[PDB]
Design a protein around this ligand. Sequence first.
Ligand SMILES: CC(C)C[C@H](C[Si](O)(O)CNC(=O)CCc1ccccc1)C(=O)N[C@@H](CC(C)C)C(=O)O
Ligand SMILES: [Ca+2]
Ligand SMILES: [Ca+2]
Ligand SMILES: [Ca+2]
Ligand SMILES: [Ca+2]
Ligand SMILES: [Zn+2]
Length: 316
Amino acid sequence: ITGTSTVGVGRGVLGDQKNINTTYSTYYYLQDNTRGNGIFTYDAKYRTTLPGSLWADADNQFFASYDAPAVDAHYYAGVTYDYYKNVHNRLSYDGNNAAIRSSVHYSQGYNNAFWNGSQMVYGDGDGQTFIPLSGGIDVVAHELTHAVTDYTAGLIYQNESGAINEAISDIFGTLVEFYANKNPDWEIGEDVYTPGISGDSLRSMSDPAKYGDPDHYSKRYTGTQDNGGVHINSGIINKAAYLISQGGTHYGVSVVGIGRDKLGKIFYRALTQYLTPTSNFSQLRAAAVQSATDLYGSTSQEVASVKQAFDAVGVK
Ligand SMILES: CC(C)C[C@H](C[Si](O)(O)CNC(=O)CCc1ccccc1)C(=O)N[C@@H](CC(C)C)C(=O)O
Ligand SMILES: [Ca+2]
Ligand SMILES: [Ca+2]
Ligand SMILES: [Ca+2]
Ligand SMILES: [Ca+2]
Ligand SMILES: [Zn+2]
């Protein structure tokens, strides 16, 4: 809508207070005009029709329980946008400042989230397995990254390419988490998962096997579930990414960590320059070393660490 840019205040899923960019026109809307072509947050009102209606508030104060998820989706989207802009010099997911849209309160007791090809969607969870998904910054960034991937490499959502697609989302979701410095970790969705059970998480990048995910190419899932295990085999790449950044010894192979920042640069470059819709793990390996090479030279430690990492997860 057309109106006056302003700032509201509200409480997020975790009960934290924060300021949000809104737009004033009769009502106060969850419309952030400060970022690219804007960030829009909608209310799906427990239905499945999208996107629903642009979030309207009467007083610019979002302290109602029903508001929480909207606050977070809106806020975290902004943070994610900033990350891409500040860090990778990317303007929105399309690189052309496309408007970012999210819908919350999707369905009833919906334990998931997704990028529908046009926007982000978040369920509220059943309150047992999950709480409103937008409460996790890694989650929001994961979703937004799916968009980035779509506009770039276009990795098809199945089998190996789909696993890569997933890993990308986990990696960047994690990097964004570190970027915001919000109790950063190498875990996925710990903030909205099992309300419930402390210390747990949906996925682990540092130790995927902890949750039954493969951490070695030899343990790759080859069935048909999960689109051919896109959310499973991602653990392999996730583990690799972890090693590149943090370093360590996995299956007898030692990897010298190069740090988060370099990890991001390397992966972003691979994503945007070398990956294709049908790329596989092995292709991912080549893209990654090519990027590092481009960035730090063939004889660099960076290239070295990338190689060891892939070796460590049995990806040649
Ligand atoms: C919390 C976690 C990061 C959320 C992830 C969502 Si997703 O974007 O990877 C996949 N979402 C869907 O498949 C929703 C249905 C759909 C809509 C449109 C097109 C295709 C599918 C995530 O990792 N989800 C996985 C784990 C769940 C327990 C949350 C999963 O969906 O398997
Ligand atoms: Ca209000
Ligand atoms: Ca965390
Ligand atoms: Ca996390
Ligand atoms: Ca938990
Ligand atoms: Zn995903």
